[PDB]
Design a protein around this ligand. Structure first.
Ligand SMILES: OC[C@H]1O[C@@H](O[C@H]2[C@H](O)[C@@H](O)[C@H](O[C@H]3[C@H](O)[C@@H](O)[C@H](O[C@H]4[C@H](O)[C@@H](O)[C@H](O)O[C@@H]4CO)O[C@@H]3CO)O[C@@H]2CO)[C@H](O)[C@@H](O)[C@@H]1O
Ligand SMILES: *[C@@H]1O[C@H](CO)[C@@H](O)[C@H](O)[C@H]1NC(C)=O
Ligand SMILES: [Cl-]
Ligand SMILES: [Cu+2]
Length: 235
């Protein structure tokens, strides 16, 4: 159970974004139905008043929270991968529009999933703003918690993969547009019961054998990281 408080840009806290520049759900319950419109931007998708100014090459850091800002973020049981997608606000999430800018499942070195490291990072994980057309965008961050993904939701609706999904509104001002955005996958749609990473047993199977759901990370992506970039406690 977790949600996004707001964002930092190049290490600068942009202030509470909830229902302002983040299209927030009313609470931190997971999305589990794979065919539902809720897979787009969670249970309350609608244009909100504000959109954060950034430029290509900026570092955009999402900040997640559990109950209060900078609390314990998400419960330690929710082991799983983290992804960020982008789409034009044009689309409002609809159609074949979502391009993946980032994916992080399991790190063999430190033997931590992305979620474990997100807790350590005080809920902060980042992506570098790519060189796409200036304009308005949604950045969709998605945490897949797999603590019950040994089952499928379609077959047993009290279990299944859990999706904690949050769309930010981002306006990209300066960009040379060296990497124009391609068409993407739809949500709902790209994840189905048969898609890998959706059904997996983290209790019996080892985390190095985990393979995150597709699609793959767009070549025009400029990476990202899971790590604290500013102290929320100083505000
Ligand atoms: O640990 C392995 C075990 O996990 C089992 O699943 C557990 C989870 O481990 C556990 O974290 C989860 O806890 C949830 C709880 O069910 C929710 O009711 C609670 O929701 C709160 C929310 O936390 C608050 O922020 C909000 O204000 O109110 C809501 C409503 O009360 O959130 C916590 C997580 O933070 O419970 C699961 C039980 O299904 C698996 O079932 C098992 O297979 C694994 O072995
Ligand atoms: C899942 O979502 C679809 C589309 O909204 C819905 O019609 C269906 O009733 C939902 N499935 C379950 C199992 O609740
Ligand atoms: Cl949960
Ligand atoms: Cu939860």
């Amino acid at each position: 159970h977790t949600l996004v408080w707001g964002v930092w840009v190049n290490g600068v806290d942009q202030g509470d974004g909830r229902n302002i520049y983040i299209r927030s759900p009313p609470n931190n319950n997971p999305v589990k139905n794979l065919t539902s419109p809720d897979m787009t931007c969670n249970v309350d998708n609608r244009v909100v008043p504000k959109s954060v100014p950034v430029n290509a090459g900026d570092t955009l850091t999402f900040e997640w929270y559990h109950n209060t800002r900078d609390d314990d973020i998400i419960a330690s049981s929710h082991h799983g991968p983290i992804a960020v997608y982008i789409a034009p606000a044009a689309s409002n999430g609809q159609g074949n529009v979502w391009v993946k800018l980032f994916e992080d499942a399991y790190n063999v070195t430190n033997s931590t999933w992305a979620v474990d490291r997100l807790i350590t990072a005080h809920g902060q994980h980042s992506v570098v703003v790519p060189h796409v057309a200036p304009g308005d965008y949604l950045f969709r961050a998605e945490i897949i918690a797999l603590h019950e993904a040994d089952s499928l939701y379609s077959q047993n609706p009290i279990r299944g993969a859990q999706f904690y999904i949050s769309c930010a509104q981002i306006t990209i001002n300066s960009s040379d547009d060296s990497t124009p955005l391609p068409a993407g996958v739809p949500f709902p749609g790209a994840y189905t019961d048969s898609t890998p990473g959706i059904q997996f047993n983290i209790y019996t199977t080892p985390a190095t054998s985990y393979v995150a759901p597709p699609p793959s990370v767009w070549s025009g992506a400029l990476g990202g990281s899971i790590a604290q970039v500013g102290d929320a406690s100083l505000e």
